[PDB]
UniProtKB/Swiss-Prot annotation:
Protein name: Transcription elongation factor SPT5
Tissue expression summary: Ubiquitously expressed.
Oligomer status and interactors: Interacts with SUPT4H1 to form DSIF. DSIF interacts with the positive transcription elongation factor b complex (P-TEFb complex), which is composed of CDK9 and cyclin-T (CCNT1 or CCNT2). DSIF interacts with RNA polymerase II (Pol II); forms DNA and RNA clamps that stabilize Pol II elongation complex while maintaining the nontemplate DNA strand in the transcription bubble and nascent RNA in the exit channel. This interaction is reduced by phosphorylation of the C-terminal domain (CTD) of POLR2A by P-TEFb.
Subcellular localization: Nucleus
Organism field: Homo sapiens
Portion of the full sequence shown: 462 to 523 of 1087
Modifications after synthesis and translation: Methylated by PRMT1/HRMT1L2 and PRMT5/SKB1. Methylation negatively regulates interaction with P-TEFb and RNA polymerase II. Phosphorylated by CDK7 and CDK9. Phosphorylation by P-TEFb (CDK9) at Thr residues of the C-terminal repeats alleviates transcriptional pausing and promotes transcription elongation. Dephosphorylated by the INTAC complex when transcripts are unfavorably configured for transcriptional elongation, leading to premature transcription termination: dephosphorylation is mediated by the PPP2CA component of the INTAC complex. Dephosphorylated by the PNUTS-PP1 complex in termination zones downstream of poly(A) sites, thereby promoting deceleration of RNA polymerase II transcription.
Length: 69
């Protein structure tokens, strides 16, 4: 295919559970006010890739919140 945003995703699974590929924001924690995408998830915390610092932020799912959901 050519350059674009919409991809062959015939499966639209909308789940609150922060999953990889989904965007999440930071409401609390040491990064309150930061947002990014989910690159890694763990039973303890969730690692999201920041778009500002271009790094990997480690925060708990209790201080994060999805954007699309």
């Amino acid at each position: 295919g050519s350059s674009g945003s919409s991809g062959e995703f015939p499966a639209q699974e909308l789940r609150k559970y922060f999953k990889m590929g989904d965007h999440v924001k930071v409401i609390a924690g040491r990064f309150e006010g930061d947002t990014g995408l989910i690159v890694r998830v763990e039973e303890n915390f969730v690692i999201l890739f920041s778009d500002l610092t271009m790094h990997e932020l480690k925060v708990l799912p209790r201080d994060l919140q999805l954007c699309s959901e």
